[PDB]
Design a protein around this ligand. Structure first.
Ligand code: CLA
Ligand code: CLA
Ligand code: CLA
Ligand code: CLA
Ligand code: CLA
Ligand code: CLA
Ligand code: CLA
Ligand SMILES: CCCCCCCCCCCCCCCC(=O)OC[C@H](COP(=O)(O)OC[C@@H](O)CO)OC(=O)CCCCCCCCCCCCCCC
Ligand SMILES: CC(/C=C/C=C(C)/C=C/[C@@]12O[C@]1(C)C[C@@H](O)CC2(C)C)=C\C=C\C=C(C)\C=C\C=C(C)\C=C\[C@@]12O[C@]1(C)C[C@@H](O)CC2(C)C
Ligand SMILES: CC(/C=C/C=C(C)/C=C/[C@@]12O[C@]1(C)C[C@@H](O)CC2(C)C)=C\C=C\C=C(C)\C=C\C=C(C)\C=C\[C@@]12O[C@]1(C)C[C@@H](O)CC2(C)C
Ligand SMILES: CC1=C(C/C=C(\C)CCC[C@H](C)CCC[C@H](C)CCCC(C)C)C(=O)c2ccccc2C1=O
Lengths: 209, 742, 84, 73, 220, 40
């Protein structure tokens, strides 16, 4: 992961900021507000972007795959927007508290990783189970990298991480798109796509007045 | 040559100076050792000429500060329009403006504060507003809440524009000193460009959007069926029915047949009986004439072509046997000193605000404004206070110019030199005038009080006793009442209903205006006003004239403009700086404006405002008690202060309960100011010495050593609290009285 | 002409009074939505005005419905769109 | 007045009055024997306190006596 | 050189080096002293040439449908005055395949991709022949003169090989741009005064010239 | 970034943030537990 001063930029013909160097994957020189000027801020922001990207990828899958299969009839899942207010085997509060406990353990160990890199790579109960990762944000090991694709040449690793970051950015945009589309149109996302494909000249945002 | 002159990227945009408080000055930037530093940072924030000696650097700073102020004003206007659109009963008030009170603020239901949402009418609960925005919106032709939302959005956009302009002109394109000193071009553009074109555009709006919509409104048609403003431009036929002259187009304008436009361009005078305000056809013609006058005025000075005047040429040609070289040298002073220009502009603006206040009550321009007494009283008092404050600031900055920028070796002027060579004669004569006016104005009140207390009503100065008739003002009133017949033949009625034309305008069973009679009591209050104005002028002029030196202190200029004293020597030298003189003159300005607004309130409630029945009988709010009661101090104490405070003191448990609370709070703050005004910092530093011991005993003593406030700072705090408490007391009392009884 | 729009207003006095009442009532209830329980935490992700046309909140929807009524396509002064 | 305004303003004003008297015809024939000066710093505090106390006492004495004597309780 | 309302200030920096130079600058907008951002000599010539280029196409855009529809070439409903095509909905609008507000976004994207790329040439001369643009960047490198890029796309016929023809062509282009600028200003002023299109205005004037002019039209 | 964080740690900004949070907390407590004269 070496400097790349001739990489494509978000704004062709401009000069990338000095802190955006090109060693990080998926770097296009985009930081107009100077939010990552400090090295510590950049270190924190990289991890924040990674976790946001992965969570939004899972969210995009969970919204768009089940709702496409409902329109085909392979599944009969309810709408994603109102799926939170349905009745389950337990009330929503205890589900949220159990999720808080479990995800809090996981997130606290991730926080310990961020603050101190080695720190938490070893099993608390069985000393022999270790995470084989090396860089922060990529824990590795049998649990988070069973197939071994997470380690390799310093050149294929950069592109493998760039694909992840760009897919996560796209999913991050898509989740908010689905949310606002449901707020402003009153129907599902696949309905919106089909309606827009039927009448692209009219079935848009401006078809609300 | 007059041309755009800028410098590129003079100051880098960074957050590094935000993290260093006091960066703007050499002394403060080093960090604090005591608490005084914390105050010194805020007192010197906008003292730009003390930060740097470069005139260009100072000028750029003021240029960007003006953009910041404009952005703040645009934000305030956007908020006002948004609250009118979203939290107001404007649309209901439009259909019944005589029975519904304007309201544009609604409080949340917390801790029982929801009692302030009173019954303002129209199925609406809120806080009654006295800004007069509803009448201005009705005059402009605004009919729906949607047009107020668009105005709020536009004002937000404009505020963003001004903020960006300030940043751009301080950090990217900073104009040079020569650009600012192009005074002829600035005067030409402000006279012809800003004022002339602005008034022309407003006249166009009035003849195209205001006149037709108000004609529909005054005819009694529903606001929701009036055609939209653009419909009066699209099909001109709609405009050719209210005024058939519009069928002729612009041909009469270009062929010089202007009387063909007499339908919507008039010279009437008086008030609209349906509305109670000035005729809109009069206002449109006024603005159209003002536009031409200012457009011609803005062509007087020479900028780049031969035609025009030179300001220096005009100044250097005005001299005489009594004034030596005359005005020569004033162009150099007024083009190199920001403080002199600030002083002049502050004086003129403060004087103009008072004229605006006087003219708006006698000639109500907005519809249904005259019969809304709470709005009239509030506007008059507000503009009087603004004018007084600006006038005091004028003296402050004239003193600052005298202390800092005065230099006879390089910027000599004969007039200023000759004024400084006989300042003793000026100040002694003003002293004598102040004493004479104080005696022959206030001692008449004491004479009346003593005669009344001694059982001798026949020895007083009253209309039923020894008379003092304002014959000159009465003659002016009679002359103005006869103007439509002999001296203004084209005018139909006099410029105001108060001159004496023997007519009264009533709107909704309420008196708008009527001839205001002048008698002995008015003779008394007018000389009281003159006395207070003269004393304020004396205090401020003595500070301006004696700022550099006096017989007591030959070298007062080296001590600065704002210093506490020069020690207890020479008998005592407290408050000799020009700053102290402003500090003292603020009190007298407050006194004068308070007397003026009290006079206005009592006179309007006694002899103008009231109710009228369907018989022809007028009943005023206080029943004409001003003539016989306002001639004694006991009369003011009893029939005005005691009688009219009965509202604000019984407002608890009602929608007006917030005014009694503010009444008490203002009294408290006014009393609080006397601790600062009557004491000194030597006692307080010694008292703090004991508290610091108690903190050190428990290891909680701060590193920033606590200091008592400076001698000058204590005076500033005392005067600020005094003024705030005094003005808020009258604010609450006036608003409660005029909302409950008006 | 004035005495034609007077005729127009005579026939629509009640309807315009119902517009005035609705628009003032909505303006007052905008400060009381949360206490009423109409527009709050889980549905105020956007404006209560936005919720007025997608959820039918009690008082901010009557104003929206009544606002233009009996008016033409391009002649409602309280809505730019109305019948688009 | 004595509690708020301080000495230097009054001394600088008295200087002008001295000049005005010294330059006025038919008044130059009359001369003061003690040079007019402003009140001292401590003297002004005492004078202002005396006025404050006298007004404070008289206002309340008048109010109390009149209010208790208008109705006799 | 022929001068039209010159001045001492104007002739100091207007020396005939630019096409269509007549020393005309009464307000001194092109003065190089203390000049930056919008008011600089190099941005103003580019702005003049660029505005003339758009006005030259705009005059034909306004005049073509009305002239063609006055003949039997295009269907009557597609032959409208330029202000009745939907640009000014109060004067009328046409129904296209897409909503006008949706067409505005499409135009915004395409024209933005064009104009930001044009600007990055001005702010960085050779910048846009470097980053990958689907292979078009091979012909988008510019020439160092912002208003005259040339290349395979913008100057494909390769006219003005020698200096003497390029200068003459530049003069003709700035002159036609000025003339079309004035023509479009005339269109904008005539549209509200006389309710009909420019071609109707032309025809109505060469039918009875003494009753169709500004003097008569001081009524609308 | 560092300088802006330093500025946001200055006394007035921290003071307004802290008192705004306190005011919001007290207002919400009074909204959900109004008219408290005693402590049950
Ligand atoms: C398409 C998106 C994408 C891509 C390209 C990657 C890419 C990567 N991730 Mg990653 N990740 C993603 C989404 C993605 N991730 C999401 C959404 C999550 C949250 C669950 C994670 C959580 C995660 C962790 C916790 C770790 C990685 C690791 C890695 C690295 C090695 C693994 C690999 O080659 O994955 C290749 C990925 C694919 C070919 C995508 C296949 C997706 C389909 C649905 C197959 C799923 C099958 C499954 C059994 C069901 C590599 C840089 C590891 C690493 O860096 O090791 C040191 C590591 O520790 N990621
Ligand atoms: C001079 C202009 C001005 C003034 C005086 C007001 C005044 C008011 N507006 Mg208003 N407004 C304005 C301009 C103005 N506005 C503009 C330009 C717009 C258009 C955008 C609006 C749009 C608007 C709406 C939409 C509403 C108001 C409302 C109100 C009222 C309540 C405001 C309130 O409680 O704040 C709310 C509180 C805050 C904004 C907090 C203050 C933030 C500061 C920085 C401190 C931050 C500390 C924070 C609170 C603590 C938590 C921080 C976190 C990190 C923990 C009040 C009378 C409300 C009203 O009247 O309800 C009936 C209402 O609903 N206004
Ligand atoms: C016709 C031309 C014109 C106009 C309209 C103005 C108008 C104004 N000038 Mg101004 N000025 C002009 C020419 C003009 N100037 C010239 C030629 C010079 C150089 C000699 C100056 C030098 C100058 C100084 C040094 C200062 C002003 C200030 C002001 C403002 C006074 C505050 C006020 O009344 O608020 C009225 C508010 C409005 C009418 C709101 C609308 C705002 C207007 C429309 C924006 C003005 C745009 C401007 C004319 C050109 C923009 C440049 C362009 C590239 C975008 C006011 C906006 C003062 C100020 O506040 O600075 C910010 C100030 O300190 N002017
Ligand atoms: C800056 C202010 C201003 C503005 C922008 C306008 C704008 C307008 N006026 Mg106008 N007007 C104004 C002030 C203004 N007026 C004043 C002060 C008067 C009183 C003398 C008039 C009297 C007036 C009449 C009598 C008429 C207009 C008309 C018009 C419209 C068409 C003008 C046109 O193209 O033909 C004239 C333009 C040129 C010859 C150039 C136009 C919307 C006409 C119209 O269509 O009415 C809707 C029309 O018949 N105006
Ligand atoms: C457009 C008008 C204008 C402008 C541009 C200035 C500009 C200036 N004045 Mg000035 N002044 C003005 C009007 C103006 N003044 C008026 C009207 C008066 C008469 C009252 C004065 C009286 C005055 C004095 C006596 C002095 C100045 C000084 C100064 C300079 C330093 C200002 C500074 O750092 O303040 C920093 C700002 C503050 C410390 C903020 C003060 C906050 C005030 C006191 C509170 C106001 C109460 C508020 C409205 C109510 C809030 C309620 C609360 C509960 C929130 C600066 C050049 C000083 C100087 O040295 O000049 C060289 C100086 O000694 N001015
Ligand atoms: C009600 C309280 C009060 C009164 C009566 C005065 C009175 C005066 N102040 Mg003042 N002042 C006050 C409060 C007061 N001040 C306060 C609180 C402040 C602080 C802000 C100031 C600050 C201040 C300044 C800064 C200045 C004055 C000035 C003046 C004088 C103005 C000239 C004048 O009117 O003479 C006429 C005299 C009177 C009106 C007093 C009442 C006399 C009546 C007629 C009764 C007299 C009857 C008879 C003589 C009694 C004899 C009986 C025998 C047994 C003794 C005057 C002596 C100015 C000055 O000296 O200019 C000349 C001046 O520059 N004052
Ligand atoms: C020293 C003077 C003083 C005292 C003792 C009080 C005491 C009280 N006031 Mg009060 N008030 C005062 C001054 C004072 N106020 C002033 C000066 C004003 C004018 C601004 C007001 C205006 C005012 C209003 C408008 C209201 C009160 C209310 C109250 C009561 C609040 C009960 C409450 O919220 O508990 C709940 C709060 C807590 C339990 C505190 C919890 C703190 C933390 C979060 C605990 C968590 C960590 C453990 C309480 C009896 C309210 C009331 O109901 O009165 C009956 C009410 O509506 N006061
Ligand atoms: C009063 C008589 C009067 O006002 O005469 C006006 C008189 C006229 O002076 P001049 O004619 O010498 O002034 C010429 C130029 O200064 C006028 O721009 O001014 C003075 O004599 C100075 C004293 C004015 C203030 C006097 C008080
Ligand atoms: C959009 C977004 C972030 C956008 C940020 C941007 C553009 C910032 C840009 C800048 O900072 C930079 C780059 C550089 C600066 O100089 C300039 C600016 C401009 C300041 C994050 C979204 C992030 C969005 C995320 C993480 C969403 C995750 C969603 C999940 C997990 C959803 C789960 C569910 O949908 C299912 C699966 C099933 C349902 O039934 C249940 C639920 C729970 C609803
Ligand atoms: C760009 C332009 C117009 C472009 C028009 C276009 C694209 C039109 C497009 C459309 O029609 C179509 C195609 C189809 C329609 O359905 C839609 C629209 C959109 C309607 C006009 C410029 C028009 C520009 C003009 C007229 C500029 C005039 C400037 C002058 C006269 C300045 C003179 C001075 O500056 C100097 C020379 C020297 C100084 O010192 C002194 C002064 C006097 C200040
Ligand atoms: C009362 C008084 C003081 C004492 C008043 C002082 C010292 C005011 C300063 C104290 C206030 C309360 C500021 C202190 C508050 C801190 C800035 C922040 C505290 C932290 C939280 C409580 C916000 C003088 O110093 C003085 C000087 C000259 C003439 C008259 C007087 C005078 O009358």
């Amino acid at each position: 992961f070496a400097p790349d001063p001739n990489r494509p930029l978000w704004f062709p013909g401009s000069t990338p900021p000095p802190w955006l160097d090109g060693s990080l994957p998926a770097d296009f020189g985009f930081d107009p507000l100077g939010l990552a000027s400090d090295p510590d801020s950049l270190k924190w922001n990289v991890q924040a972007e990674i976790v946001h990207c992965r969570w939004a990828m899972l969210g995009a899958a969970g919204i768009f795959i089940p709702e496409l299969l409902t329109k085909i009839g392979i599944l009969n899942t309810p709408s994603w927007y109102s799926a939170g207010e349905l009745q389950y085997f337990t009330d929503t509060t205890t589900l949220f508290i159990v999720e808080l406990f479990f995800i809090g353990w996981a997130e606290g160990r991730r926080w310990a990783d961020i603050l101190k890199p080695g720190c938490v790579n070893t099993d608390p109960i069985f000393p022999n189970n270790k995470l084989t990762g090396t860089d922060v944000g990529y824990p590795g090991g049998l649990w988070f990298d069973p197939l071994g694709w997470g380690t390799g040449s310093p050149e294929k690793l950069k592109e493998l991480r760039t694909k992840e970051i760009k897919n996560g950015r796209l999913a991050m945009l898509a989740v908010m798109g689905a949310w606002f589309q449901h707020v402003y149109t009153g129907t599902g996302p696949i309905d919106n796509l089909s309606a827009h494909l039927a009448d692209p000249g009219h079935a848009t945002v401006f078809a609300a007045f | 040559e007059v041309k755009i002159l800028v410098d590129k990227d003079p100051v880098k945009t960074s957050f590094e100076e935000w993290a260093k408080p006091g960066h703007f000055s050499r002394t403060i930037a080093k960090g604090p050792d005591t608490t005084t530093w914390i105050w010194n940072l805020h007192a010197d924030a906008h003292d730009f000429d003390s930060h740097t000696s470069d005139l260009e650097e100072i000028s750029r700073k003021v240029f960007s500060a003006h953009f910041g102020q404009l952005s703040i004003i645009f934000l305030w206007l956007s908020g006002m329009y948004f609250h009118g659109a979203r939290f107001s009963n404007y649309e209901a008030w439009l259909s019944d403006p005589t029975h519904i009170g304007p309201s544009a603020q609604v409080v949340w239901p917390i801790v029982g504060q929801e009692i302030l949402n009173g019954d303002v009418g129209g199925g609406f609960r809120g806080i009654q507003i006295t800004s007069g925005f509803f009448q201005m919106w009705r005059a402009s032709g605004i009919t729906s809440e949607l047009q107020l939302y668009c105005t709020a959005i536009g004002a937000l956009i404009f505020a963003a524009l001004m903020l960006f302009a300030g940043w751009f002109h301080y950090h990217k394109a900073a104009p040079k000193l020569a650009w600012f000193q192009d005074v002829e071009s600035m005067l030409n553009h402000h006279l012809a460009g800003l004022l002339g074109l602005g008034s022309l555009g407003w006249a166009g709006h009035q003849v195209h959007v205001s006149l037709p919509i108000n004609q529909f409104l005054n005819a009694g048609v529903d606001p929701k069926e009036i055609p939209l403003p653009h419909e009066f431009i699209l099909n001109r036929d709609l405009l050719s029915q209210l005024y058939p002259s519009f069928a002729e187009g612009a041909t009469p304008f270009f062929t010089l047949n202007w009387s063909k436009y007499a339908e919507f361009l008039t010279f009437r005078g008086g008030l609209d009986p349906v509305t109670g305000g000035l005729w809109l056809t009069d206002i449109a013609h006024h603005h159209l004439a003002i536009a031409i006058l200012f457009l011609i005025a803005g062509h007087m000075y020479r900028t780049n072509w031969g035609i025009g005047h030179g300001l220096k040429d005009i100044l250097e040609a005005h001299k005489g046997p009594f004034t030596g070289q005359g005005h020569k040298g004033l162009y150099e002073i007024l083009t190199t000193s920001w403080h002199a220009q600030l002083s002049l502009n502050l004086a003129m603006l403060g004087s103009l605000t008072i004229v605006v206040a006087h003219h708006m009550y006698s000639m109500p321009p907005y519809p249904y404004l005259a019969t809304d007494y709470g709005t009239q009283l509030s506007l008059f008092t507000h503009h009087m206070w603004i004018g007084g404050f600006l006038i005091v600031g004028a003296a402050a900055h004239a003193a600052i110019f005298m202390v800092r920028d005065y230099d006879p070796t390089t910027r000599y002027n004969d007039l200023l030199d000759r004024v400084l060579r006989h300042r003793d004669a000026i100040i002694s004569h003003l002293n004598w005038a102040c004493i004479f006016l104080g005696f022959h104005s206030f001692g008449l009140y004491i004479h009346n009080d003593t005669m009344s207390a001694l059982g001798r009503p026949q020895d007083m100065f009253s209309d039923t006793a020894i008379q003092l008739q304002p014959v000159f003002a009465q003659w002016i009133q009679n002359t103005h009442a006869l103007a439509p017949g002999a001296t203004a033949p084209s005018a139909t009625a006099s410029t105001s209903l108060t001159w004496g034309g023997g007519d009264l305008v009533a709107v909704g069973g309420k008196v708008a205006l009527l001839p205001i009679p002048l008698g002995t009591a008015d003779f008394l209050v007018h000389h009281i006003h003159a006395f207070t104005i003269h004393v304020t002028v004396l205090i401020l002029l003595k500070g301006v004239l004696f700022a550099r030196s006096s017989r007591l202190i030959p070298d007062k200029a080296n001590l600065g403009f704002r210093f506490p004293c020069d020690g207890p020597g020479r008998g005592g030298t407290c408050q000799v700086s020009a700053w102290d003189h402003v500090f003292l003159g603020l009190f007298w300005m407050y006194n004068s404006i308070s007397v003026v607004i009290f006079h206005f309130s009592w006179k309007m409630q006694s002899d103008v405002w009231g109710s009228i029945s369907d018989q022809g009988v007028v009943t005023h709010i206080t029943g004409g008690n001003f003539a016989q009661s306002s001639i004694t101090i006991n009369g003011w104490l009893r029939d005005f202060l005691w009688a009219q405070a009965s509202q604000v003191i019984q407002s608890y448990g009602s929608s007006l309960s917030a005014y009694g609370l503010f009444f008490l709070g203002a009294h408290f703050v006014w009393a609080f100011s006397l601790m600062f005004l009557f004491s000194g910092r030597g006692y307080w530093q010694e008292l703090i010495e004991s508290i610091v011991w108690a903190h050190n005993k428990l290891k909680v003593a701060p590193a920033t050593q606590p200091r008592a406030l400076s001698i000058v700072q204590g005076r500033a705090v005392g005067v600020t609290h005094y003024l705030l408490g005094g003005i808020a007391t009258t604010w609450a009392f006036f608003l409660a009285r005029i909302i409950a009884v008006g | 002409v004035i005495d034609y729009y007077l005729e127009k207003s005579k026939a629509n006095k009640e309807l315009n009074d119902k517009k005035r009442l609705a628009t003032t009532d909505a303006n007052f209830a905008r400060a009381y939505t949360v206490e009423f329980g109409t527009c709050k935490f889980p549905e105020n992700f956007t404006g209560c005005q936005d919720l007025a046309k997608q959820k039918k909140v009690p008082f901010l929807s009557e104003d929206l419905d009544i606002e233009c009524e009996g008016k033409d396509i391009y002649k409602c002064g309280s809505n730019v769109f109305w019948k688009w | 007045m004595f509690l708020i305004s301080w000495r230097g303003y009054w001394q600088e004003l008295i200087e002008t009055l001295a000049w005005a008297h010294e330059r006025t015809p038919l008044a130059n024939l009359i001369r003061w024997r003690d040079k007019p000066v402003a009140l001292s710093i401590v003297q002004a505090r005492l004078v202002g306190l005396a006025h404050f106390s006298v007004g404070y006492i008289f206002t309340y004495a008048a109010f109390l006596i009149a209010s208790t004597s208008g109705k006799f309780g | 050189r022929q001068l039209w309302f010159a001045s001492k200030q104007s002739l100091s920096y207007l020396n005939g080096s630019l096409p269509g130079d007549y020393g005309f600058d009464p307000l001194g907008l092109s003065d190089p002293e203390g000049a930056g951002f919008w008011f600089q000599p190099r941005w103003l010539s580019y702005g003049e040439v660029f505005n003339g280029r758009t006005a030259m196409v705009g005059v034909i855009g306004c005049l073509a449908p009305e002239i063609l529809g006055k003949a039997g070439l295009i269907p009557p409903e597609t032959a409208l005055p330029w202000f009745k095509t939907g640009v000014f909905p109060p004067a009328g609008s046409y129904e296209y395949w897409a909503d006008p507000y949706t067409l505005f976004v499409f135009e915004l994207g395409l024209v933005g991709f064009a104009e930001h790329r044009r600007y990055q040439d001005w702010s960085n001369p050779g910048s846009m022949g470097k980053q990958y643009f689907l292979g078009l960047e091979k012909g988008l490198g510019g020439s160092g003169d912002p208003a005259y890029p040339g290349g395979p796309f913008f100057n494909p016929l390769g006219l003005g090989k020698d200096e003497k023809s390029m200068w003459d062509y530049k003069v003709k282009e700035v002159k036609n741009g000025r003339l079309a600028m004035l023509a479009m200003l005339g269109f904008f002023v005539q549209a509200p005064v006389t309710g009909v299109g420019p071609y109707q205005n032309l025809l109505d004037h060469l039918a009875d010239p003494f009753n169709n002019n500004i003097f008569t039209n001081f009524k609308f | 970034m560092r300088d802006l964080k330093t500025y946001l740690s200055v006394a007035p900004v921290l003071s307004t943030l802290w008192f705004g949070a306190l005011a919001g907390l007290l207002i919400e407590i009074n909204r959900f537990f109004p008219d408290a004269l005693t402590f049950p």
